Amino acid sequence: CKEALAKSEMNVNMKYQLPNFTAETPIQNVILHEHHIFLGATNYIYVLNEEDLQKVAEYKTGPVLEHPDCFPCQDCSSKANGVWKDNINMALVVDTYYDDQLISCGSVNRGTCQRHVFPHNHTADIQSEVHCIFSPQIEEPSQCPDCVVSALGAKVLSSVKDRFINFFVGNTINSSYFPDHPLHSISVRRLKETKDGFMFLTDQSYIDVLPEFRDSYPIKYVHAFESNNFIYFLTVQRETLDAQTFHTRIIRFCSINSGLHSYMEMPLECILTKEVFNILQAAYVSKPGAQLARQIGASLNDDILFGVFAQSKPDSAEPMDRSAMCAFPIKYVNDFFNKIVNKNNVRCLQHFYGPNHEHCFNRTLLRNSSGCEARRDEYRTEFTTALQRVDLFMGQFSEVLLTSISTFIKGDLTIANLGTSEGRFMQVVVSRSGPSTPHVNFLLDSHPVSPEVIVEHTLNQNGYTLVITGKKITKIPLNGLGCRHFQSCSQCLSAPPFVQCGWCHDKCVRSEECLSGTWTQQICLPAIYKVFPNSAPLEGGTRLTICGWDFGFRRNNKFDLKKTRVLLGNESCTLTLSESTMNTLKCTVFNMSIIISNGHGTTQYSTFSYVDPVITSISPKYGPMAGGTLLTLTGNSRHISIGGKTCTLKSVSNSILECYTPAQTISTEFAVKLKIDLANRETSIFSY
Amino acid sequence: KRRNTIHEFKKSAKTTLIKIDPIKTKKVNTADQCANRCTRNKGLPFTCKAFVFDKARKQCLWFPFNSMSSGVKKEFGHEFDLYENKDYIRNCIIGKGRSYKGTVSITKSGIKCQPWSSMIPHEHSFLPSSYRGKDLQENYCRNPRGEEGGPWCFTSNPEVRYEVCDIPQCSEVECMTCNGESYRGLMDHTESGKICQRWDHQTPHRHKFLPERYPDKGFDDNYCRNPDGQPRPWCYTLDPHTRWEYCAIKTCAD
Amino acid sequence: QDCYRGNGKNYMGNLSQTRSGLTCSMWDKNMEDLHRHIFWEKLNENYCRNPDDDAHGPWCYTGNPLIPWDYCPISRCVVNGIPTRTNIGWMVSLRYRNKHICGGSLIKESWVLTARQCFPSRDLKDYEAWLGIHDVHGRGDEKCKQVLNVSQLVYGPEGSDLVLMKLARPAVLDDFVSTIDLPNYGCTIPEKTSCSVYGWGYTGLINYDGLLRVAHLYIMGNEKCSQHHRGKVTLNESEICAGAEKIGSGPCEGDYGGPLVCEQHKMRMVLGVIVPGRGCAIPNRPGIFVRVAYYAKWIHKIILT
Secondary structure, eight states: OTTGGGGGSOOSOOOOOOOEEEOSSOEEEEEEETTEEEEEETTEEEEEOTTTOOEEEEEOOOOEEEOTTSOSSSOOTTOOOOEEEOOOOOEEEEEOSSSSEEEEEOSSSTTOEEEEEOOSSOSSOOTTOEEEOOOOOOSOTTSOSSOOOOSSOEEEEEEESSSOEEEEEEEOOOTTHHHHSOOOSEEEEEEOTTSSOEEOOOGGGEEOOOTTSSSSSOOEEEEEEEETTEEEEEEEEESSTTTOOEEEEEEEOBOOTTOOOSOEEEEEEEEEOOEEEOEEEEEEEEOOOHHHHHHTTOOTTSOEEEEEEEEEOTTSSSEEEEEEEEEEEHHHHHHIIIIISOGGGOEEOHHHHOSSSSGGGSOOOOTTTOSOOOOSSOOOEEOOSOEEEEOSSTTTTTTSOEEEOOEEEETTEEEEOOEETTSEEEEEEOOSSSOOOOSEEEEOOSSOBOSOOEEEEETTTEEEEEEEETTEEEEEOTTOSOSTTOOSHHHHHHSOTTSOEEEOSSSEEETTTOTTSOOBSSOOOOEEEEEEOOBOOSSOOOEEEEEEEOOSBOOSSSOBTTSEEEEETTBOOEEOGGGOOSSEEEEEOOEEEEEEEESSOEEEEEEEEOOOOOEEEEEOSBOOOOSOOEEEEEEOOOEEEETTEEOEEEEOOSSOEEEEOOOOSOOSBOOOEEESSSBOOOOOOOBO | OOOOOTTSEEEEESOEEEOSOOOOEEEOSOHHHHHHHHHSTTOSSSOOSEEEEETTTTEEEEESSOTTSSSOEEEOOTTOEEEEEHHHHTOSOOTTOTTOOOOOOBOTTOOBBOOSSOOSSOOOOOHHHHSTTSOOOSSOOBOTTOOTTOOEEEBSSSSOOEEEOOOOOSGGGOOOOTTSSSOOOOOOOBSSSOOBOOSSSOOSSOOSOOTTTSTTSOOOTTOOBOTTOOSSOEEEBSOSSOOEEEBOOOOOOO | OOOSOOSTTTOOOOOOOOSSSOOOOOHHHHHHHHHHHOOOOOOOTTOOOOSSOOTTOOOEEOSOSSOSEEOOOOOOOOTTOEEOSSOOSSEEEEESSSSEEEEEEEEETTEEEEEGGGOSSOOSSSOEEEESOSBTTSSSOOTTOEEEOEEEEEEOSTTOOEEEEEESSOOOOSSSSOOOOOOOTTOOOOTTOEEEEEEOSOTTOSOOOSBOEEEEEEEEOHHHHHHHHTTOOOOOTTEEEEOOSSSOOOOOTTOTTOEEEEEOSSSEEEEEEEOOOSOSOOTTOOEEEEEGGGGHHHHHHHHTO
16 A cells, blocks of 8 residues: 555655744855855845854945936935836845955846945945946946946856956846847956956957847856866756757856857767756866766766756756756866867857858867967867766756755765755755655755855864755754654664764654664664555465565665565565565465565564354345345355356455356256355355 | 577687786696686686697686787697677677677777776766676777677767667678588677587587588687588587587678 | 976976967077077077076077066066146156056156056057156146157066066257156165155046146065055065055055056155056055066067167
């Protein structure tokens, strides 16, 4: 009875009290810094203490009049003619190279960015001091060095090269936005050291999609990170200017402020096995645990890129809610850039060069022989042979959309802070070696999990993970949010050891609570829920379903169904492999106790009957032969027939029986023989 | 338990092999035992692809290396009787060929095989520890699942994930002269897909011919011949059920 | 792949490729030429181990004339100022698309000393140097204005943030245009020594007519700047830190490549380069520069080209 014993499966939905902070508006970005945790949110910035998430302070970038002639950071409150738009933060960074400051980067106000300064004694008081970053470009007013961030979507990454705060920013551009005020697809900004503007160091320092492909070919960037003196980007975009179909892409260049010098795109795909997942949903860069190190072949110290992909709705960008997560050891992808792809996989780069223009008629690629020497005829190359990865979960998530991921290490295992589209926050001990079941699968909130997460990992034993869902910021102790939810012994023993708890005879429980001292984590008893049926004739070796759990022997992942046997009295009932599961048994053999032996222990259950059948009375006795009448029987999985024809059971009971008689072209009476899998004692004759 | 394998082993007697730059010995009566020790999964802590027996020293030594390797020296030590495993020297397929160990690293379309150790460019390559014993070496292409299509490998070429190495049968270079007894060949494949019985041993089915009493008619290894000139070759079977069966060989011309 | 051995002989470097991208040449002709040239006192053919046990570590020879030799890349272990009343010679006005971008120092008759930060483009078809000027646009005077093209760029050691640029043609040297000497190899400044910066930069003026602006200064110990910066500076050997006392005045945008020139004993001499860091002109906060002394020898070896 698989349904009934499903109570063995863990309670997916249990409610937890964790430090939960709520905002008035949706939260987009969040940054952790010096025992304060700032949040950008629609029309607002908040600052939080960690361990309580008390909103200590706030600063108000609320709705702004947008009027065409009102300049960005000049004050046009006096204007009476033109709409009270609102701003949504898309870039919140912290700088400490210059001074302990926060930088916010608004949406509506032409995308011009501003600063808050931390006083020395007190750091939370951000409202006290604010500038704008606005430099009237007198020299070349035609271009914006200060109109930084777009509206549709953007990613911003701060860095300190050469004693130089550089913002690498990517924007999504609609065709309409340009002629009013230009922007750029990927660009490198120096902050002017007097902290009152940005400069474009060279025309070469930005890349903008050519004027014609603005409305078509939109690229939206999904992640941006730094490693090994390269600044990678992760975006999603069309396979070809007219393919109307999509994949993920990766961007590489090194970090000379002069401009993007070795600009290389590569396609990235993760398959399952050959079904491909196109669209990336979120990513996180981390170092791997010891176990996974070899298992993907990476050294323990190398950077690792974890990405959750969703398969798209075909010829469209919308995820189909089928997902995977896949690991890309940065040495391997960087190597792909340098060595693996041969010459004629490479091409020129469409959206910038334009498909028909001089350079990519012919150009040598100093791809191997040189690593980003800043030359003059730099060549932006678009590869074509996607870097194929395979799933880490082997598609155990093939039906549920993933939206946010993070990863930390612990012991030797490595853990993923997965998040789905409907607000469930799993944690999985990830390994290609074994399909591992999440040890936390509670529902967080109705709204989808935001990809912006933070994990902070103090002293390797106390850490936490801020996650953002809708309007909610929550602190989850990664240390194992609990183990009360486990109810199946096998599940108790599979939960990774970093959460100290083990079975004590009835439920997975922390060690120091249940007194019986039966609390164990290595060996435990098989258990039975029910048995069907319990009425067996002496000759009947009949199909007995056994409902229970823990019917398998243990191997850390693989649960050994072969170290199982059934003992009935003295004989052993006939155990059949293909129908024996750690879920259920299907065996085929004066109340008697059945005993079930497994590779660990054995269970006794006290009530099975070798009931001896009885039949005594039949109705009718004398009658006609029409073969349409109702016979009734009584006494103590069966069948019944007369004259080779089965009387259909009009009523079943242990102590009452009713057939509809077969019609027989005969006028005499017959003793009727019961066929309960076996011809047991026949009854007497009834006059047809 | 006690099961025979030595049909699979390759025999050359009155010879010895030494690799001077490096083996486990135990007190064994019959070469049959040490052979089974080799063949069986994880039988020995080292992967013995050969071994020599001498009835006289009552000792057996096992080499994790065949004569095919470099650094081996071949000498006439008459008491020593070599034992190879023809599976490596096969340069054949046999059906699915689940137990293919040969050293072919090229595919049908001629692109190099990816090493099973390196995850680039393709990743479904964890198998070196997944399946103990299937002798998946550095690069050479095997059939770890015993999948039907043939021994396949991953290509260094990034586009194509796996392609099956084309590899011959043993039958394609084997013909039979109409009599067959003149043919002195290399096959060990009957029509019913069974491997012959050892001539020199008489177990389990007991047959009349011994190679020593009929030398130069080549009753060596388990090679289907015509000991009495039947139309097409034949041997006694290992199988307890069938006494004896033919072997199917195609014909050659010119 | 080298640590604690900045001396070449301690490191038998098995590598044959320089910083720039050119392979090392056949060592023997170089041994002949160097024994003719270099006088330090049998090392491998054509491997970048440096013989001379130079301060900066392993280095290699290249065939090409414009670059005789370069290192093979290995791991190893003004605001509130005064106008200047008089024309000045060390000042080098660097001009990028015909406008000023940085100041530089005049070393020899065809050589100027500037900072890496000041070269957005590597191109030379655009850079143009002027010497002998009192107004950043030259409207004040032109008699001493010397316009020269730029011949070649040479980068410093790795981690140096220091660069030299050599001119297409020499210049006439007179009173209007002057050079400055260099420090002794370990020339270590006395603490509390007074000396000044000259700059062309932002100056924090609502209007600046374009006079070059001078700001005095006093050398402080590295420890004092660690105190003022509150651990925001992790001081290395090669830097100097000199800070205005009780007043916030320092070089800012436009001053990079500017010289820290100081009078030691009887004459005045250059000690540092103005380079951006830590912010601008913060009151009661020092300033941070790169000490030419740590690189003076490298300047010599390169100037022998």
